[PDB]
Structures are given as C-alpha cells and as structure tokens.
Design a protein around this ligand. Structure first.
Ligand SMILES: Nc1nc2c(ncn2[C@@H]2O[C@H](COP(=O)(O)OP(=O)(O)NP(=O)(O)O)[C@@H](O)[C@H]2O)c(=O)[nH]1
Ligand SMILES: Nc1ncnc2c1ncn2[C@@H]1O[C@H](COP(=O)(O)OP(=O)(O)OP(O)(O)=S)[C@@H](O)[C@H]1O
Ligand SMILES: Nc1ncnc2c1ncn2[C@@H]1O[C@H](COP(=O)(O)OP(=O)(O)OP(O)(O)=S)[C@@H](O)[C@H]1O
Ligand SMILES: O=C(NOCCO)c1ccc2cncn2c1Nc1ccc(I)cc1F
Ligand SMILES: [Mg+2]
Ligand SMILES: [Mg+2]
Ligand SMILES: [Zn+2]
Ligand SMILES: [Zn+2]
Lengths: 427, 314, 167, 229, 229
C-alpha cells in the first residue's frame, strides 16, 4: 500500500499507506526536505482535484494520486513610516499628483498621500482639500553652399559627413533613396516643426537640402559621445558628475515632451558631452525616415539597436508603440549604464535570445551589479523606470523632480547611517 | 595526405597553400578595391587585389568600436585560421586592424553566396541540394574534430561556391570574443537559431543541424518557411521578428510537401528538424542516412549547371 | 540560471536517499524507508555558477525499475552508488552502468562512482577495488558518508562538473 | 548693503531655516527701496513656507478634533492649541499685509509686479478666511474679492493667456470661489476658460517658463476633473 | 495631570511641532514621577528630531563654507551663522545632558533603562564632538567611550544579545569608533561579531520585536558592505 504524491517545483514522492498515519505526518519529512510546512500548503486528491484535510488517514487514500499547492495567509511586510510634509516640489509615488501633506518611508523614500495608503506595495522593495499654486524657483538651404565633408560613420538610417556652411556643420546622409510625395510632405512638416525649436541642451536643427540626394544638416558638435567615455576609455565618473549628467539629460527630455515630440531613439551613442561639462542631445524625431513606407502607409518596421528598446516596442501589438514610456525606458537603461559601467545583458551573446527573452518578459536588466556607494533612492528610481507594464512607469516631470530632490539631498547622505527611529506610525 | 581527399582537391589545396606562401604582411595600402561584393548586416565585402602580388582576393570590413585590448585579443584569436586546412572551408589570407575597422582577407569566390543563386533561380533541384549537404556535414565534422568549434550561425548566406563547383563554408564562430562583440551591434529581419538555444541551454551542433535543415528547406521552396505557406502559398510549386521567434518556439516545425520531394529527403529533413535536440541525430547518424547514401551514389555536373543558370560561358 | 538533472542510482540500501537528503537539508536519516520515487530541487553555487539541481532519487529495489528508468531517461548525469559493506552492490555497478547505457542509448554519459557508508567499521570493499572500478570506466571515485556528511558535496559537485565537461 | 541680506536669505533657503529668512527679507522690505523681480520670489517662498506649515498644523489638529468626539478636556486642550496657532498665524498674516500695503502696493512701477502683489494679497486674505469665522470672515472675503477682481482685470488687459502668473491667479481665484462661495458652476466655467486660453498659445513656451506653466495647467485639469462631480 | 502632558506631547508629535513637546517632556521628567519605557521613547524621538535637523543644517552650512574659498568675505559671515547655530546646539545638548544627571541616572530602577540612558548620553556626547575641537572634543569623546563601555558591559552581563537596544548600542559605538578613532578594522570586526551574535540568536523573539531587528540588521549589512572597501 503506497500513495504517489506530486509536489511543487515539478517534484514528486511516494509514501506508504499505513493505517493510523495522516497525510500530514506522511509528507512532513518531504516538506522539511523541501523547505515547506503543511500549515502553509494545501493538499488535493485526484478524483479533477478535490481538497482534503491534512489529518486525513493515508490508508483510505491507497493507490490514489495527491497534489500539493502552497497557500498564502501572511504576506506581512512593512516600511519605516514617518509623518512629514514636503515644502518643495514632490509627487506621490502612487497617485502621481502634487503632494503637500502625507507620509514618508525613512527606508527607501517612498512618498504617498494620506488617501493612497492602502495602495502602497506591501514589500519594501529597495471632500478633500483642493490643490494650490506651488512655489516658483520651407527651410531648405540652396545648393552650392554645402561643403561635402568626410565620411565618419553609418548608423541605423544614415551616414555622417562633416561639412562647412558658415562654419562647421553636421550633415547626415539618409539611407532612404526614393521618398514618396506623401513621405516628402510629412518630412517637410516634421522639419518645420523642428525648426522653431531652441534649447541649451539640444543640438540646433539647421535645415536640409535635396539637390545632392537627400540629407539632413545639423549643427556639428565637438568632443565625443557618452558611449565612448563609458566603454572606450573606461573612464570612471564620480557621484556628483554622474548625477549631474543624469539631471542634465533629463532636463532636455522634459522640454522635448513639452513640445510633444517623441525621441524614440535615446541610446547612449546619441548623447554628447560638449566642452566636457554640458549634456547635448541630437538625432531625434524624424518619424518619416524610420518605418520604411510601402506606399501611402508607414507600417511599423523595427530598426536600430535592441538594448535600449522597451518590451512593448519589441512586442509590436500596439498601433503606436513609440510613446513617452519608450523614452522613459530608454532613460532607465541610460541610468543603469552610467551607474554600473557595464552594458546590460553582459552574460548573453545571442541577440536573438536577448530579443526573445525581453519580449516574453522573462529577462530584465540586473539590479545587483550596481556599486555600493549609490544611495538607495537612486536604486528605487532606476527600478521604477524599468517596469514591464507601460501604465505604471513615471513621466519625466516626476523623474526630474526626484532627481532634483536626491541631488540637493547629496551633502548629508555621504556618511553612513546612524541610529534609526522607531515605527512611529499607525496601522 | 591524412584525409579522404582525391587528387583534385589535394592538388587545389596545395596550390592555394603555395599562393598563401607568396603572401606576407597585410596592410590597408596593400590592396585596391575592385568592386563591392555585397553589404553585410554590420559590414560590407569588397573585391580587392593585392597590388604587390596582383592576386585578387575577398575582403570583408567590419565596423565595431571596441577598446584596443579586445582588438588585440581578437587578433590573437584569429591566428588559428592558419592551421585550418580543408576543402570545405573558404580560404583565408589574414586580417588586420586599421582606421577603426576590422578587415579580413579571404579567398575570393566567383560562384557567390547561395542567396543570390536562389534569388536568380527561384528553386533549386533536389540533386543539386543533396551534394551541398554532404560537403556541409564533412566541413562541420572537420571543424568539430580539429577545433571543436560550433558554427552557431549556419545559414545560406555563409556558403560560397565557384565556377568549378567547389563548396566551402565561412562566417564560422572561431573567435568567441568577436561573437560577443557582434551580438550588440544591430538587428536582423529573419533568424535561424534553434528554439532550445533561445532558452539558454547549450547543445553544441544540434542547433547547427536544425538550422541547416531549415536552410535546405527554404532553398528548396524559394520562400522563407516561417510562417508556413497557407493554401495558395503552398500551391505555388511583413511578419514581425518577435512573431517569428514566438512561432518558432511554440509551433511544430514545417515539412517538405509530399510528392514533389523524395520520401527519403522528407524523412531526412524530419530527422534534422526534430523539436527535441536530444532526439535529433548527430553528424555520424546523418552520414549513414539512406538519402545521403543515394546522394553519394548519384553524380551531378553541378558546375556546368550553375554556369548555365548564372549565364557564365563554361 | 543553469539547471542540471542528476540521477542517483544503485542497489537497495546503499544510501542514495541519505546522500540526497544530506545534500538538500544537511540532515542524516537513520531510518530505512525504501524509495519508489523521489525528486528534489536545490539551488547551489558551484564554481561560481548559481546552479539549479534537479535530483532524481531512484529505487534500488528492482521491482520499481520501470519507475527508475523513467527518471534515468530524463537525467543528464548519474551518481552510481554502492556501499562499502556490500560487495554485491559494488559488483552491480556494472549492471547500473549498463542500464544507463541502455536507457540513454549512449556510451558517453556523465557518471561518478560513489562508495558510501565509509563511517562504518569493518569495511569490506577496499579502496583499491573501488578505484580500479572507477578507472575501468574512466570516471571519478568519491568516498562518502551520509552520516558524517564527508564527501557529500564533492560527489554531487563532481557530477555537475562532469556534465559541464560533457556539454 | 542689501545684497548682504540677499545672500544671507539665499543661504538660509538651503539651510531650511525659514524664520531667519523671513526676518531678513522683512528687513529688506523695511529698507523702503523698490525691489527686483528675483527677490520677490524669495520673499513669497519664505513666507509661504511658514504659512503652509501652520496650515498643516491647523488641518491635523482640526482632523483630530473631529475624530475624537469624546467627553474629556483633551479636546479642550487641543482647541486651545488650535486657537494659539491660529493667533500666531493671524499675527504673521497681519505683518505680511502691513509690509505689502506699506511698501510694495504704494510702489508698483511695472503692472506685472502689481498683479503679483495683488495675488499675494488675495491669497493671504484666503489664508485668513480659512480659519476666520464671523463678520471678520465676511470682511476679509470682500477684501479678497476686491484684490482678485483688481488683479484679474489687469491680467486680462496686459498679460498673455500663457504667462504663469495669470495661470496661478486663475487657479487661486477658482480655489477661492469653490471654497468660500461654494459655486462650482462659475468656478468650473472660469477653469475651462483659462485652460482654453492656455491651450490657444500652446506653442509659445520659451526656455524661461515651460515646466511651470504645463504643471499649473495639469493641476487645473486635475481640479476640474475632481469638480466634475 | 501627567497623563494630560502625555496627551499634549502625542498631539504635538502628530502635528510634528517638536520644541513644545521637548519642553513638555523636560517638565514631565523634572516632575520626578516614575518613568516607563514607552514614555521615554517619546522624549528620545522628540530630542532626536530637532537635533538631527540642526545637525543636517550644520553639515550643509559647513559644506558651503568649503564650497568656495577664493571669494569675498562672505564665508566669514557664513561661519558666523554657523557658530551661532553651534552655540544653539550646545545649549540644548547641555540641557539634555544635565537632564540625565538630574533625574534619569539617579532614578535608575531597571538595568535596560540604565543602558538606554547611557546610550543616549554617549550619542549626545558624539553629537557635541561633531562640532567640538581640541581638548574639549577629546574630553567629550573620552566621556562617550566611558558610557559606551559601561553600557555594553551591563548589556552583555544582564540581557540577551538579540534585543534591538543592544544592537543599536553596538552600531552607534562602531559609528563613533569610525568617526573619532577612525579605526575601520576594529569597528568592522566588532560590527561583524555583533551581526554574527544576532544571527546566532534568531527565531527566538516576540511578536513586537520582529521588525526593529530587521531594520537594524539591514543597516548593519549596509555598513559592513560600505566599510569592506
Ligand atoms: N552508517 C551509515 N548508514 C548509512 C549511510 N547512508 C545510509 N545509511 C543507512 O542505510 C540505510 C539505507 O539508507 P537509504 O538512504 O534509505 O538507502 P537507499 O539506497 O536510498 N535505499 P532504496 O534503494 O531502497 O531507496 C538507512 O538506515 C540509512 O540510515 C552512511 O553513510 N553511513
Ligand atoms: N552633431 C554631431 N557632431 C559630431 N559627431 C556627430 C554628430 N552627430 C553624429 N555624429 C557622429 O555620428 C556617428 C554615427 O552616427 P550617429 O547616427 O550619430 O550614430 P548612431 O547612434 O549609430 O545613429 P543612430 O540613428 O543614433 S542609432 C557618431 O559616432 C558620432 O561621432
Ligand atoms: N566568400 C565569398 N565569396 C564571394 N562573395 C562573398 C563571399 N562572402 C560574402 N560574399 C558576398 O558579400 C555579401 C556580404 O557578405 P556577408 O557577410 O555574407 O553578408 P551577410 O550575408 O549580410 O551577412 P550574414 O551574417 O551572412 S546574414 C554576401 O551577401 C555575398 O554576396
Ligand atoms: O563574418 C562573419 N559574419 O558575417 C558578417 C556579417 O555578414 C564572422 C562571424 C563570426 C566570427 C567569429 N570569428 C570570425 N567571425 C566572422 N568572420 C569570419 C570567419 C571566417 C571567415 I573564412 C571570414 C570571416 F570574416
Ligand atoms: Mg555574412
Ligand atoms: Mg532511497
Ligand atoms: Zn519603504
Ligand atoms: Zn497619492
């Protein structure tokens, strides 16, 4: 008289069917061997699955097949909550609105409103008053003026030639050969959108030309890319310098989103470190030259690199996968690259496998390779930026604000922790 | 010898070795580009000639920004090719680094890759296909014995031929560091990796066998087998990449249509496309396959047929 | 990350289950509860790699060899266990190796020879016999005691290393 | 030299010591010289911090008072604490109003500074009223009405429908309406009109003020959505 | 009477207003009535809030002091402000220290209360030494070491090593060693020993003492991780 038992984690065992012996006593040894306890698990019999008591005699179950499923009764969990009110710009992590009076975790810095308490994640993973007024603190250059420069490199959709037009200018030779009239019109519209733009941290857009094939003319930049300094010379950066770079990079993304233009291609190659101090970004927008047209349509064709692509843009089940969340995810990968100094997925050499495992959600960037001097708040920010779902990702105003807060909080957090406070919360 | 090489193959190998002995150091200024042979996924191939010797060779340039240490490591790893000598491998001359570019000097092949031949021919006769498979198996065996290296990138684009009918392989993964470097370069349209290797489990040449079988099927049908032809698509005798990968992982593999292909060939491709890599036969078991025996028994004037199909005058 | 399927085989009573339970839970079972089938999972770092071990502990009683054969077919490497006080269990290592060859349809299967119960007095299978048998198959020999835990990790970790070599 | 006081207040800002900052800026106000655009922000923020802290204290005390509903003198003690903090808040607001009406209102060369000062006056009257109860509440409500009307007229006349000051003034006026007059219809109408005006010039967003304007607009949308009920 | 003071202190803590609560607890302990652990926890938290805020302010001010050197004589007035802040800190520190000798240390009825008071004395000695210099700092740190050793000996001889209070005492002692003796080796060894002792005594505590231990152990792991380099 024996009973065959199926166990979680695709395991199994057989126990004898002795009279006077319960199922719980029979399987206690197996559960202890497998780090489980009967009280936190359920037992079912095949008859399709019928739950039975743990105290049931195994003798009456002779010849039967049993299955064990783990229960869930005590999530428990907690954070160290201290009441506090922020006098600068801040937002609830859950409710995404302005935050004047609420609660704060001393552990990780999670902030939420009084009314948002029941929605806070359980695991410390590392008639109301209205709001108020918070504190305050046709442009084609004619031919004969473009100096055909020297070939430099070829990217996802273009080629680089540094020419002369009233000084050094950057010219990108597009890989598109035959633009459709509708495609040409849309290209002109987007160029006109870009022309009336100007910012300290965005490269100037300087028109275009169409006589010598079709190419884009932009302001040339001196120096080198971020990707070079992170992985060519392997020059390390200090916390102040690194967070400053991140803050500057985020500064321009808010501007671009304010003018309602999706970057779609923020990879570490596309960030310049001009004059060794100022972050400048180029090579953005241009929806026309990507997703090669089959006619009067531009059905989405994937192109470029895959490390900085978000899961949804890979999945391609959405009509307009390139949304603000794509730029958010790109910024997350950029933060990770700056913080670790190692490219993501450094243990997989098959790009097909990388694509597949990103698409099914099975693989995410490492979170243990971070250094041991980065404050936990930046880790929380980085973790939040890389969420699989696109709905819960933050938008760039919030990330800019949190970066600003953690930056101004820098001088006091360098030293080690001291004595922590007690619970000081009511639940 | 020490191998099963006839007089012709041995003599041609000796001649190529003698030609290599006439080639010394390689530099950028030592070669002049004659024509472009095609652009790769992250590079391009140019027909070049070594002016100090006048020999016309094939040169592939790879653009990948890496640190000098990795460059020198790849240079050291590339030196193994000198001891590699087999009729089934594209001849090489050498490689060097210059101008932030990776250049490799290899034997120029006038026959071109199988992709252009298939494009200009539509479909390939089974007799022609059978001859290539045995040479592929022998080359894979040579690589696995002499160097224990799995190609991992077996596809029609990596097979070159000549007007003489000889078949050789290339683009093998000899340098693992270079393999890792090219991993994060750009994106492709269609792939051929085995479903198990997508799961992080290594089974060496089983994936190569699986990829070879699918490549042979595609060359036989004149269409990418994924997705399988539907009704009128099969009667003719823009899918997303993620869709293709998921379909490959979670669908039964396709098969040759009945009647138009010999049952031995259908059994061979079924064995070569077993979903379980463990159940898939190895090179030894595939060698003793009845279809392979028939192919060996058969004799085909492949060189003349290829010249006629391309249009070359003998 | 890396999963290894390990099968423990050998004659009844040699200590297959006691060895497995020492690996999984660091506890020695002194009772003799004959196995019909038992499988376990254990995550362990071996040579710097985080390994998921599936341990398939089989019946020594030949009455249940059909179940044993189903476990063997899924396995990647085999611990072939005898007891140092049971000469027939030692002689029957040949039987178990032949079973592995039959079920795996291969003569090239990772295997480690384990001589268990080395804490006992009056040992009757000597070191020279055991090392000669392991040598005859080209496999490692590990002495173990499930009671003292001597050799337990070495036996399983060596098998993992043999599987890696074979891959 | 007032610049020394300016630097002192700037240091105190990051020092998070707001009482000393308030006193230092009050000294500069007492100097009786016309202020710059920059210093006005510091003054407003400095007083706003203290007023907001006191407001939060009053809110939590009132919430506790509504919560207890017992029979004990703890409620009386809490009410005494509430009246004490209300008294000190009244003193602070009176000081701010006096300084404003004696130095800033009399000397307003540029209309924008006048609009800002009137907005401050109205918001501080609202701060008074939210604890005020009785005839004095009605009087300060009327004074806030006058200030808001005066500011709104000049804003509609000589201020773009995109500049942040006008947006904040509209927000404050809407809040004052919704809280004091409890007239959601007109407040919603004003909010919709202001949002439409802002959307009209959705392009004219220069480097100087891009995030603040859109942040205010988002807050307006949120309040309108909340008021839809 | 005293219960009314307790309610007042709880209300103040809820409203985050601290100085009034500090004075209330000071008079509560000056009354000389029996003091329980729950009551003194409120006093400790109250003093901790203000002292930590002012410590942060001093740290920021000192950072700004050395932020710029080749400039005008504004660093001079900045350091004058810093000295004023330091004097303010010294006054409250002296009051706190004298409070122990007045009521806490003499009215010592239970060993864990003595451990708690000595730990507080050492912590505030370290706080003073943060700004103290020279012979005064040396004397203060010697006094801190004396209290540290006395508290640790009693903790070792009397109660279990798995209680959170002992863990906090060890952590603070290690931090003091790092910040004064600057001996990473001795402090690291002591921290590792304490962590191992805590790990040995696991799964043997009460329902209430299941969360404090987690935070303390996490902090210990963080300190060891940072100090390993
Ligand atoms: N002294 C000693 N006894 C051991 C050792 N290993 C196992 N035993 C004892 O030998 C008996 C059989 O052990 P067990 O692990 O059940 O053997 P098994 O090979 O799994 N038997 P089966 O094939 O029936 O499943 C038990 O009484 C066990 O305590 C050992 O190393 N030393
Ligand atoms: N404004 C610029 N000034 C200087 N160099 C530039 C400028 N824009 C592009 N480049 C160079 O262009 C090279 C390759 O072209 P890019 O398209 O910028 O790179 P890329 O990232 O491969 O292309 P994409 O579309 O961004 S993926 C880079 O390595 C830069 O050195
Ligand atoms: N040995 C060769 N002899 C003659 N032509 C060759 C040879 N190798 C490559 N070519 C040609 O050059 C082109 C570019 O080389 P490839 O590296 O094969 O490009 P590719 O096919 O895009 O790269 P993959 O990785 O194989 S898809 C090929 O498509 C052929 O037309
Ligand atoms: O060429 C390659 N991939 O294709 C490029 C995209 O078309 C390739 C790919 C991997 C690799 C590892 N070590 C060398 N490797 C290559 N080089 C190579 C190998 C053999 C010959 I013979 C000539 C060669 F250039
Ligand atoms: Mg190729
Ligand atoms: Mg057993
Ligand atoms: Zn938390
Ligand atoms: Zn919220």
């Amino acid at each position: 008289p024996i009973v065959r038992v199926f166990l979680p984690n695709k395991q199994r065992t057989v126990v004898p069917a002795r009279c006077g012996v319960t199922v719980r006593d029979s399987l206690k040894k197996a559960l202890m061997m497998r780090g489980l306890i009967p009280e936190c698990c359920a037992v079912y019999r095949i008859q399709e699955k019928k739950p039975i008591g743990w105290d049931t005699d195994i003798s009456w179950l002779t010849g039967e097949e049993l299955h064990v499923e783990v229960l869930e009764n005590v999530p428990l969990t907690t954070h160290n909550f201290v009441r506090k009110t922020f006098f600068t710009l801040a937002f609830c992590d859950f409710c995404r609105k302005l935050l004047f009076q609420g609660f704060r975790c001393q552990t990780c810095g999670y902030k939420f409103h009084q009314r948002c308490s029941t929605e806070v994640p359980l695991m410390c993973v590392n008639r109301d008053r209205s709001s108020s007024a918070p504190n305050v603190h046709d442009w084609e250059i004619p031919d004969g003026q473009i100096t055909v420069g020297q070939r430099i490199g070829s990217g996802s959709f273009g080629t680089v030639y540094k020419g002369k037009w009233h000084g050094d200018v950057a010219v990108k030779m597009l890989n598109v050969t035959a633009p459709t009239p509708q495609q040409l019109q849309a290209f002109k519209n987007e160029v006109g959108v870009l022309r009336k733009t100007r910012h300290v941290n965005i490269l100037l857009f300087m028109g275009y030309s169409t006589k010598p094939q079709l190419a884009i003319v932009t302001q040339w930049c001196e120096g080198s890319s971020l990707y070079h300094h992170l992985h060519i010379i392997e020059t390390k950066f200090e916390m102040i310098k690194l967070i400053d770079i991140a803050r500057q990079t985020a500064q321009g993304m808010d501007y671009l989103h304010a003018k309602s233009i999706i970057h779609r291609d923020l990879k570490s190659n596309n960030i310049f470190l001009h004059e060794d101090l100022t972050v400048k970004i180029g090579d953005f927008g241009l929806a026309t030259v990507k997703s090669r047209w089959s006619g009067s349509h531009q059905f989405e064709q994937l192109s470029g690199s895959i490390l900085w692509m978000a899961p949804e843009v890979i999945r391609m089940q959405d009509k307009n996968p390139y949304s603000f969340q794509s730029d958010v995810y790109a910024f997350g990968i950029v933060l990770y690259e700056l913080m670790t100094g190692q490219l993501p997925y450094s243990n997989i050499n098959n790009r097909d496998q990388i694509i597949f495992m990103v698409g099914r959600g099975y693989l995410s960037p490492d979170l243990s390779k971070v250094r041991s001097n980065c404050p936990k708040a930046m880790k929380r920010l980085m973790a939040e930026c890389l969420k699989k779902k696109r709905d819960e990702r933050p938008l760039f105003p919030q990330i800019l604000a949190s970066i600003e807060l953690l930056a101004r909080s820098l001088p006091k957090i360098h030293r080690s922790a001291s004595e922590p406070s007690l619970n000081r919360a009511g639940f | 010898e020490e191998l099963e090489l006839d007089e012709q193959q041995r003599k041609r190998l000796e001649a190529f070795l003698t030609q290599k002995q006439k080639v010394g150091e390689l530099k950028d200024d030592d070669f002049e580009k004659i024509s472009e042979l095609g652009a790769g996924n992250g590079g391009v191939v140019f027909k070049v000639s070594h002016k100090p010797s006048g020999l016309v060779m094939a040169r592939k340039l790879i653009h990948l920004e890496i640190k000098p240490a990795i460059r020198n490591q790849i240079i050291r790893e590339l030196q193994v090719l000198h001891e590699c000598n087999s009729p089934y491998i594209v001849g090489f001359y050498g490689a060097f680094y210059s101008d932030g570019e990776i250049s490799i000097c290899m034997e120029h092949m006038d026959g071109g890759s199988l992709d252009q031949v298939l494009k200009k021919a539509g479909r390939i006769p089974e007799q022609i296909l059978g001859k290539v498979s045995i040479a592929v198996i022998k080359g894979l065996t040579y690589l696995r014995e002499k160097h224990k290296i799995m190609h991992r990138d077996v596809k029609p684009s990596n097979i070159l031929v000549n007007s003489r009918g000889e078949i050789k392989l290339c683009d093998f993964g000899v340098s693992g560091q270079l393999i890792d470097a090219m991993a994060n370069a750009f994106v492709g349209t269609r792939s051929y990796m085995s479903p198990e290797r997508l799961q992080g489990t290594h089974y060496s040449v089983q994936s190569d066998i699986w990829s070879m079988g699918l490549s042979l099927v595609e060359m036989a049908v004149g269409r990418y087998p994924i997705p399988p032809p539907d009704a009128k698509e099969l009667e003719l005798m823009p899918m997303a990449i993620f869709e293709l990968l998921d379909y490959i992982v979670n669908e039964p593999p396709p098969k040759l249509p009945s009647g138009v292909f010999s049952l031995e060939f259908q059994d061979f491709v079924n064995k070569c496309l077993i979903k379980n890599p463990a159940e898939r036969a190895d090179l030894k078991q595939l060698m003793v396959h009845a279809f392979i025996k028939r192919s060996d028994a058969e004799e085909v004037d492949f060189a003349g047929w290829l010249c006629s199909t391309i249009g070359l005058n003998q | 990350m890396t999963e290894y399927k390990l099968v423990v085989v050998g004659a009844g009573g040699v200590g297959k289950s006691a060895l497995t339970i020492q690996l999984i839970q660091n506890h020695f079972v002194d009772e003799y509860d004959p196995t019909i089938e038992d499988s376990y999972r254990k995550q362990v770092v071996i040579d710097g790699e985080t390994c998921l071990l599936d341990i398939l502990d089989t019946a020594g009683q030949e009455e249940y060899s059909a179940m044993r054969d189903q476990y063997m077919r899924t396995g990647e490497g085999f611990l072939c266990v005898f007891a140092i006080n049971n000469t027939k269990s030692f002689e029957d290592i040949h039987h178990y190796r032949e079973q592995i060859k039959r079920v795996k349809d291969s003569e090239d299967v990772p295997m480690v020879l384990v001589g268990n119960k080395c804490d006992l007095p009056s040992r009757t299978v000597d070191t020279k016999q055991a090392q000669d048998l392991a040598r005859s198959y080209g496999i490692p020999f590990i002495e173990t005691s499930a009671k003292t835990r001597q050799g337990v990790d070495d036996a399983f970790y060596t098998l993992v290393r043999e599987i890696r070599k074979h891959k | 030299d007032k610049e020394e006081l300016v630097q002192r207040a700037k240091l105190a800002e990051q020092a998070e010591r707001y009482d000393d900052m308030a006193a230092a800026m009050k000294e500069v106000t007492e100097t009786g010289v016309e202020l710059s655009n920059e210093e006005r922000n510091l003054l407003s923020v400095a007083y706003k911090n203290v007023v907001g802290a006191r407001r939060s204290s009053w809110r939590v005390i009132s919430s506790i008072e509504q919560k207890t509903e017992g029979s004990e003198r703890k409620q009386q003690m809490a009410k005494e604490y509430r009246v004490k903090v209300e008294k000190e808040l009244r003193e602070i607001c009176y000081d701010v109003l006096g300084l404003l009406d004696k130095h800033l209102i009399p000397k307003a060369s540029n209309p924008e500074s006048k609009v800002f000062y009137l907005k401050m006056k109205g918001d501080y009257y609202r701060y008074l009223a939210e604890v005020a109860t009785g005839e004095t509440r009605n009087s300060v409500v009327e004074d806030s009405q006058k200030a808001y009307q005066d500011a709104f007229e000049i804003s509609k006349a000589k201020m773009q429908p995109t500049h942040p000051i006008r947006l904040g003034l509209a927000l404050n006026f809407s809040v004052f309406y919704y809280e004091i007059l409890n007239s959601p219809d007109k407040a919603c109408q004003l909010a919709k009109q202001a949002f439409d005006d802002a959307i009209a010039e959705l392009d004219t967003l220069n480097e100087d003020s891009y995030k603040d304007s859109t942040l205010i607009m988002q807050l307006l949308r949120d309040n309108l959505t909340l008021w839809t009920s």
